[PDB]
Every structure is written in structure tokens, then in C-alpha cells.
Amino acid sequence: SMKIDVVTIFPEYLQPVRQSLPGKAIDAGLVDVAVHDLRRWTHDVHKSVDDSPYGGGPGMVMKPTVWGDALDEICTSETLLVVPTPAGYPFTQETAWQWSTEDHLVIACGRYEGIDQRVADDAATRMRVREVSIGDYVLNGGEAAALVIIEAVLRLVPGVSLLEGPSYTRPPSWRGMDVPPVLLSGDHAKIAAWRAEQSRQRTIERRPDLL
Amino acid sequence: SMKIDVVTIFPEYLQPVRQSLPGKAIDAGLVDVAVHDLRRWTHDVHKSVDDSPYGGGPGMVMKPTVWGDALDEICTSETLLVVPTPAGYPFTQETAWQWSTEDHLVIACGRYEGIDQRVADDAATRMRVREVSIGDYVLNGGEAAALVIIEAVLRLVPGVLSLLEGPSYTRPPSWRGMDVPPVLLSGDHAKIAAWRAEQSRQRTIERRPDLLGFDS
Numbered sequence: 001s002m003k004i005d006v007v008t009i010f011p012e013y014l015q016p017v018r019q020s021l022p023g024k025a026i027d028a029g030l031v032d033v034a035v036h037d038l039r040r041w042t043h044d045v046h047k048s049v050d051d052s053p054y055g056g057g058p059g060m061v062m063k064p065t066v067w068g069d070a071l072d073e074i075c076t077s078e079t080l081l082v083v084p085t086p087a088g089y090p091f092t093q094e095t096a097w098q099w100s101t102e103d104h105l106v107i108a109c110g111r112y113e114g115i116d117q118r119v120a121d122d123a124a125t126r127m128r129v130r131e132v133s134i135g136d137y138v139l140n141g142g143e144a145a146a147l148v149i150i151e152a153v154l155r156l157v158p159g160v161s162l163l164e165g166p167s168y169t170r171p172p173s174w175r176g177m178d179v180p181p182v183l184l185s186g187d188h189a190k191i192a193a194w195r196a197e198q199s200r201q202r203t204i205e206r207r208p209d210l211l
Numbered sequence: 212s213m214k215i216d217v218v219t220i221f222p223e224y225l226q227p228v229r230q231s232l233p234g235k236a237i238d239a240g241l242v243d244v245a246v247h248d249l250r251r252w253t254h255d256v257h258k259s260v261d262d263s264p265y266g267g268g269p270g271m272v273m274k275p276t277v278w279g280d281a282l283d284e285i286c287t288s289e290t291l292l293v294v295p296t297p298a299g300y301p302f303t304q305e306t307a308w309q310w311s312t313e314d315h316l317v318i319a320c321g322r323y324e325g326i327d328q329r330v331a332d333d334a335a336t337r338m339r340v341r342e343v344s345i346g347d348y349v350l351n352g353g354e355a356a357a358l359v360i361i362e363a364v365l366r367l368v369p370g371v372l373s374l375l376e377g378p379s380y381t382r383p384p385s386w387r388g389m390d391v392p393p394v395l396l397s398g399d400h401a402k403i404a405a406w407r408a409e410q411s412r413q414r415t416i417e418r419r420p421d422l423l424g425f426d427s
């Protein structure tokens with residue numbers, strides 16, 4: 001089984017992924033995803049979660065005292081703490097496979113300007129911490145990245161190179177375009193070879209880095 | 212103003228667009244986001260959107276007929292049609308800047324093993340089409356990728372407001388016995404700039420050496 005806890009100031013952002021888990025998976029206790037409003041751990045009447053950056057500059061930095069309290073409550077020694085950030089290590093399919101066998105993921109969603117670095121650094125002294133980027137672009141906050149990570153990981157939990165080439169289905173002719181006849185040939189070795197060439201061409205065109 | 216139409220068999224998944232930055236941009240009238248149920252364009256009682264692949268293989272492929280009808284209605288020749296796919300060109304910060312200037316994005320979200328290739332090929336005879344991958348991982352469908360693309364693009368549109376950013380800090384100056392780097396408290400703009408530039412380049416070599424032209 002896997003437990004995922006997500007901490008965010010926008011808990012409703014995660015609601016359409018809880019309502020996305022099959023009832024059978026939950027009933028079988030294979031998965032539980034819980035979302036927590038970071039403001040539960042604020043200290044002041046204004047429910048402050050960020051503050052101006054030391055050393056100056058634009059934006060705000062999320063408060064270590066608030067995050068520290070939240071993670072103290074939610075995390076245990078077994079936790080893998082995931083922090084989405086454009087400054088992270090790359091999150092890849094390999095990462096997804098690795099995390100798919102974890103018992104407890106906690107995903108700390110913050111603004112891209114960051115969570116005070118002492119939060120992750122403190123957490124790393126008693127649990128595993130992974131700061132990760134889902135791509136080479138900036139998002140305002142970590143919530144959409146959390147959705148991507150949750151989906152990529154959970155689809156690898158049972159019951160919860162080259163690029164793929166083009167796919168086709170009925171009808172065989174549509175708006176003047178025919179399905180490649182080789183796919184209708186019943187020559188399955190030839191079909192495999194054709195698909196391999198399609199994959200090669202597409203990878204050269206779109207992702208030459210992979211070669 | 213920008214218009215973004217999203218087409219999906221799971222319109223409820225696109226509800227998060229009402230949150231955070233996209234929500235604020237919508238309320239500020241800088242963008243209109245409309246989500247459409249692809250099944251609106253089916254005609255059978257079963258509302259089928261998929262069929263087995265020609266040539267074999269696991270799973271199902273989304274039918275071109277339903278998609279063609281949907282895109283016929285929603286798209287114009289000025290539309291930028293965005294198709295998330297793990298087999299797409301990379302979506303990068305440069306892409307986000309480029310698309311931030313667009314009048315009309317339509318994001319076609321696939322499921323199963325993807326969409327019959329003729330949908331994109333047909334659309335390309337009438338409009339610009341972009342098949343894009345948001346990263347090197349596989350999702351179950353295009354919906355989460357649509358959210359990522361919308362978030363990355365909208366924060367760049369006029370009026371909504373390389374290397375890795377290094378660590379950031381805020382009050383208190385000491386916490387759990389961990390001190391904010393003294394230079395950040397020193398008020399010396401030059402020394403702070405230099406420390407930050409250095410932290411940025413150091414984090415980059417460790418986490419993203421590719422950005423500086425190194426292996427891995």
C-alpha cells in the first residue's frame with residue numbers, strides 16, 4: 001500500500017485526483033491520498049505562510065516555522081519528502097518507478113520562489129528528501145507538478161530510448177487519409193519493422209537528444 | 212485577452228484551473244478558460260470515443276471522427292492546437308513564452324493509448340498544431356499536462372505580472388540551530404549578488420549539469 005500526503009495552501013487543487021482513485025483500490029487499501037491545508041500550521045491570526053527574502057529581491061519565501069510544524073506532524077522516519085521546484089533534480093520515468101514502491105510520500109507544495117531552504121535541510125537529517133523539477137519551465141507553485149507526480153507514480157502501482165510512433169483505428173479512410181496499408185497486412189513481423197522505423201524517424205525529428 | 216479551450220473526456224479533472232494563478236487570471240478577465248466534454252460530439256447511445264488499434268497492440272486508440280467534429284466546432288485557422296503526448300516535442304520555458312502571445316489555444320487531451328494520428332494531421336491542413344511532451348514520464352492522459360501548460364503560459368501573459376535559482380531564506384535568522392547565511396544579513400548588495408550567483412551555478416552543476424553543457 002502507499003500513503004500520499006499533500007500539503008498546500010490550495011487544497012482544492014488536489015481534489016480532482018482523490019476523486020480519480022478507483023473505489024476498489026481504496027477498499028483494498030492499496031492507496032490513500034490525503035490533502036492538507038498548510039494554513040492549519042500557521043501561528044498568527046493573519047495565517048501567514050510567507051515573508052520577505054533575506055538578501056532582498058522579488059517575491060516572497062515560505063516560512064520555515066510553518067512548514068517545520070506541518071512536516072513534523074505529517075512525516076515519519078519512513079517518509080519520502082517530495083518538494084516540487086523548478087530548481088530540482090529532474091523527475092523522470094525512472095524516478096516514478098523508484099517511488100512507486102514507497103510506503104509514504106509527502107509532497108510539499110510551495111511557491112516557486114521557494115520554501116526557506118532550512119526546511120528541506122532539517123528534514124533531510126531524519127528522512128529522505130527529494131527536490132524535483134517536472135520540466136524546464138517555471139510554474140507559480142508546486143500544485144500542478146504534484147498532480148503530475150502523483151499520476152506518474154500511482155499508474156505504476158498495480159491496481160491503482162525511442163518515442164512511440166503514430167497510432168490508428170477505424171475508419172480505414174478518414175478525411176482523405178488512409179491508415180497505412182502495412183497495418184492491415186497481417187504480416188506482423190513487417191508491421192513491427194515499420195513501427196520501428198516510424199519510431200526512429202519521430203525520435204530523430206522530435207527528440208534527437210534521446211539518440 | 213486569451214481564450215483557452217480544453218477538450219477532454221474528464222472535464223472534472225480541469226477544475227483546478229479555477230485555483231491559484233489561473234483562477235486569478237480568469238477573474239481579472241485576462242483569460243477565458245472553457246472545458247468541453249469530448250462525448251458531446253458522439254452520436255451513438257454508448258458514446259464511444261475509442262476503438263482497438265490497427266496493426267495490433269495493447270489498449271485502445273481514440274477515434275478520429277469524434278475529435279474531428281469537436282475540433283471543427285472549436286477551432287479556427289488562427290487557433291494553436293496543442294496536443295499533449297509523451298511522444299511530442301519538448302514543452303520548455305521558451306515554448307511558454309511563445310504561447311503566451313497567442314489569442315487562442317485549444318488543448319486536446321487524449322486518454323488510452325492516445326489519439327488517431329490523422330486528427331493532428333487533418334488539423335494541420337487548417338491550423339498550427341503542436342504535439343508536446345511536458346517531461347520524460349508517462350501519464351494516463353493529457354489532462355494533467357494541460358494544467359501544467361496553462362499554468363506555465365498564463366503566468367507570462369502581459370498583465371498577469373539558463374541556470375537554477377539557489378536557496379532562499381526568510382525570518383527568523385536562526386531556526387532549529389540553523390542560521391541564514393551571514394552574507395544575506397550583511398546588506399552588501401554586491402556580496403549578496405555574488406554569493407547568489409555562485410549558489411546558483413553550484414546547484415546547477417549538482418542537479419542539472421546538462422544546463423551547463425556537462426554529461427548526465
Ligand SMILES: OB(O)c1ccc2[nH]ccc2c1
Nearest residue numbers: 295296321349350351352353
Ligand atoms: O505527456 B504525458 O505522458 C501524456 C500525454 C497525453 C496522453 N494521452 C494518453 C496518455 C498520455 C500521456
